[PDB]
RNA sequence: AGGGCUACACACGUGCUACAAUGGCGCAUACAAAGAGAAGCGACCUCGCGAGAGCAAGCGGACCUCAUAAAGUGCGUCGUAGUCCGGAUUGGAGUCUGCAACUCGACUCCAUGAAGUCGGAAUCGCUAGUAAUCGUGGAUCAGAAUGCCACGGUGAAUACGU
RNA sequence: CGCGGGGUGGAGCAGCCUGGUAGCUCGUCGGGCUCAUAACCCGAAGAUCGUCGGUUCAAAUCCGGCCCCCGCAACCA
RNA sequence: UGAGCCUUGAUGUGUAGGAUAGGUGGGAGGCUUUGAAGUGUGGACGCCAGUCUGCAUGGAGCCGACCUUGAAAUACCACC
């Protein structure tokens, strides 16, 4: 298994998006690139929209997903299938 | 009523006021106020930072690289 | 005396034997047998039943199988209805540990396979 | 198999010339063409015209002669449970179920008949039907299979011969020693006779015996014409 | 700044190690060459199952260290059952380089435990320190070697004939 | 009346007799080869072997029953 | 020369088995020069030299009950 070390992260970039966020409970979805950064208490109830490299997807932030990272819900590869080959895409 | 084919008796016809005795009378949560994940739920419970032990020698307080030092 | 029958390996010495229990690979038999007072160069079929029991009662603590495939069981299960991407690579059936997709899925995803063209 | 060696040549030789014989002449030459130091036994070889395609076209079951035959008839008792002295007193020699279970299954036999009860034979004795030469497996077809053991035991000893068919209409039957006079000897044919003359079907009423053959044991053998109805000699 | 080629329905080129017992298991046991260590590595140290941790004499490398070189040997042990070979996967915990280890990073290590019994079509180097096989170090080098470069262990059949 | 032969992957065959072992030509689908085209090589899938039951470690085969197709039987007159 | 009827005579080279497996009853072996076997002579007799074997001489053997392999077991006489 794979670790986060010893340090502490916070995130420099949600700190500043959560802080002006959390002031009004919630807000418009919240202009994230931070791919780096792990789901916290401070962010619960928050509405982060996850670069992906091609477009923003929205994660909706949640209990359960904190032991997670932001670039986990929101997806980069893409699976052709073997049912029968992809014909189309999905955006 | 068939009687014989009923299971028994030992818990039914004795004491519909009964405690807790050896187990619960009612669970909380089971009709779901939220949908159940059967998760434990990390960093929320818990650290995102590991546990220290192992190496535990006198900490100090101002700056020292290994490699840095001859 | 076999430790628990089943599957052990006949006139074998002590230390690869115990593997059928299970709970207890190489490294913790060695503890076990070290404890009870056994050296490892014996064969298993020397032993009392009554070495048996004192083996049988420091495995009963450790692990039962039918807790551990259950806790993988379980593991794929949860991270699969959340939708993380550990989760979404164990869907597919490919490697979650970095190894390759194009070649080596087959251990998990399992043999190779017709493509009709 | 039936292998050219020295035991047939010398019998081969003490004959006059081989032909079908009227069955008082038969026995009297049989006799004479013994050659072993143990005492021969003689059985009857009858070609039947039944059809003999299963079971309803064909002769089965046992007799019991008059006179015994000088062998002793080596019977097991295989069963699963019974008083034993009961069945040695009878006349039997080993009443078990392991034993004869474990011979039936190896494919080799010491004893020459087991009687077995039905609970016995149906597991092992039953299915078995390509069953070679020495027998092993009780049948039904025989009347060897019985839950009155004690009977069967006492009636094999005294005198009980089987008859039965292989893939053909032939009946090959115990009749006795070369010990015996013609008289006795007779009398134990038309014992056999009479039995396989009781059990013969209704569309057995064209030509019954079409050849006879008698035989002795590790000696040689004597063609028959016929075997005649009478008990007698003279 | 994030994301990718490291994708997955697969085929193919190459190399690795294996499919045993010539070995592997346990316990005991042996000797390398060559080179790297000035920004760096490093005995003893105290902590740690190990990795690693935090301290540090010392070094200039024929002094100290990477590094226990492995294969091979000793003894006792194993029979085709994918095992007593092979040990991949995966769960889980400890550790690491870096704001930051999720797809795409490293290491230790616990438990369970598969494919594969020499493989169709295809398919290559070799004349002898070679070929085969076993391990090492270094170049690169944030973090990662099956590869490349060289080194030493152990070291083959045969070359009639055109 | 009676005798005797046959019932195979989607289509036509082989194997058969004390047996196991699905084999040949097609149609199908994937791969390989040659500098390339070319012919050619290689694998796979496909069946209750007419259907039922029995013996045996083994049945398409041997054994018992049933439905179907055909030759002869010169027969329905 | 078919068919019927009939006198005797044999090979059986199995997956597993030392070799000798058509179905199967009698039935536990033939000691007769050891039943042998054996160079040698002939004979039955075949998945081609293999199973069995007559005999001057030969006390040296098929091969079971047993010992052993198998679904079935084996001698030797019969029956076909």
Redesign the pocket.
């Known amino acids: 298994?794979?670790?986060?070390?010893?340090?502490?992260?916070?995130?420099?970039?949600l700190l500043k998006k959560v802080e002006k966020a959390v002031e009004s409970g919630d807000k418009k979805p919240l202009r994230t690139?931070?791919?780096?950064?792990?789901i916290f208490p401070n962010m619960i109830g928050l509405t982060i929209a996850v670069?992906?490299?091609?477009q923003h997807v929205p994660v909706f932030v949640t209990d359960e997903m904190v032991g997670?990272?932001?670039?986990?819900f929101?997806?980069?590869?893409?699976?052709?299938?073997?049912?029968?080959?992809?014909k189309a895409k999905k955006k | 009523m068939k009687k014989d084919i009923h299971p028994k008796y030992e818990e039914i016809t004795a004491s519909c006021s009964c405690g807790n005795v050896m187990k619960i009378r009612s669970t909380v949560g089971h009709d779901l106020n939220l949908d159940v994940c059967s998760k434990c739920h990390?960093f929320f419970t818990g650290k995102?930072?590991?546990?220290?032990?192992?190496?535990?020698?006198?900490?100090?307080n101002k700056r020292?690289?290994?490699?840095?030092?001859? | 005396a076999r430790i628990a029958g089943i599957?052990?390996?006949?006139?074998?010495?002590a230390?690869?034997?115990?593997?059928?229990?299970?709970?207890?690979?190489?490294?913790?038999?060695?503890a076990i047998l070290a404890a009870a007072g056994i050296?490892?160069?014996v064969?298993i079929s020397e032993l009392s039943e009554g070495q048996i029991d004192t083996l049988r009662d420091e495995v009963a603590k450790?692990?039962v199988?039918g807790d551990?495939?259950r806790?993988?069981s379980?593991?794929?299960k949860?991270?699969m209805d959340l939708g993380?991407?550990?989760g979404?690579?164990?869907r597919?059936?490919?490697?979650?540990?970095?190894?390759?997709?194009?070649?080596?899925?087959?251990?998990?995803?399992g043999?190779?396979?017709?493509?009709?063209? | 198999?039936?292998?050219?060696?020295?035991?047939?040549?010398?019998?081969?030789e003490k004959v006059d010339?081989?032909?079908?014989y009227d069955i008082n002449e038969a026995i009297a030459l049989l006799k004479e063409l013994a050659?072993?130091?143990?005492v021969?036994?003689?059985?009857v070889?009858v070609?039947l015209g039944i059809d003999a395609?299963?079971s309803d076209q064909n002769v089965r079951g046992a007799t019991v002669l008059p006179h015994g035959?000088?062998?002793?008839?080596?019977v097991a008792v295989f069963t699963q449970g019974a008083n034993a002295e009961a069945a040695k007193a009878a006349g039997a020699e080993l009443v078990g179920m392991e034993d004869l279970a474990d011979?039936?299954?190896?494919?080799?036999?010491?004893?020459?008949?087991v009687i077995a009860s039905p609970d016995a034979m149906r597991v092992v004795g039953?299915?078995?039907?390509?069953?070679?030469?020495?027998?092993?497996?009780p049948?039904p077809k025989?009347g060897t299979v019985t839950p009155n053991v004690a009977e069967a035991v006492k009636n094999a000893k005294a005198g009980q011969?089987?008859?039965?068919?292989?893939?053909?209409?032939?009946?090959?039957?115990?009749?006795?020693?070369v010990d015996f006079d013609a008289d006795k000897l007779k009398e134990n044919l038309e014992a056999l006779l009479v039995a396989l003359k009781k059990a013969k079907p209704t569309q057995a009423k064209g030509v019954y015996i079409?050849?006879?053959?008698?035989?002795?044991?590790?000696?040689?053998?004597?063609?028959?014409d016929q075997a005649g109805l009478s008990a007698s000699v003279n």
């Open positions: 298994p794979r670790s986060l070390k010893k340090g502490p992260f916070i995130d420099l970039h690139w931070s791919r780096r950064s792990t670069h992906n490299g091609r997670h990272k932001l670039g986990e929101a997806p980069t590869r893409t699976y052709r299938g073997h049912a029968a080959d992809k | 990390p995102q930072r590991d546990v220290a032990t192992g190496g535990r020698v006198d900490r100090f020292f690289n290994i490699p840095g030092s001859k | 599957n052990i390996p006949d006139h074998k010495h230390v690869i034997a115990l593997t059928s229990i299970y709970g207890v690979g190489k490294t913790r038999s060695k050296a490892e160069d064969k450790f692990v199988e551990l495939r806790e993988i379980m593991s794929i949860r991270l993380c991407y550990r979404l690579r164990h597919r059936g490919l490697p979650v540990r970095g190894q390759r997709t194009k070649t080596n899925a087959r251990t998990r995803k043999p190779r396979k017709p493509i009709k063209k | 198999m039936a292998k050219l060696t020295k035991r047939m040549r010398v019998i081969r010339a081989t032909k079908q050659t072993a130091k143990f021969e036994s003689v059985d070889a070609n395609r299963k035959t000088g062998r002793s008839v080596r011979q039936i299954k190896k494919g080799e036999m010491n004893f020459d008949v039953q299915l078995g039907q390509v069953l070679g030469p020495r027998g092993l497996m049948n025989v011969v089987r008859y039965r068919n292989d893939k053909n209409g032939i009946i090959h039957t115990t009749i006795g020693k079409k050849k006879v053959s008698i035989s002795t044991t590790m000696g040689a053998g004597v063609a028959v």
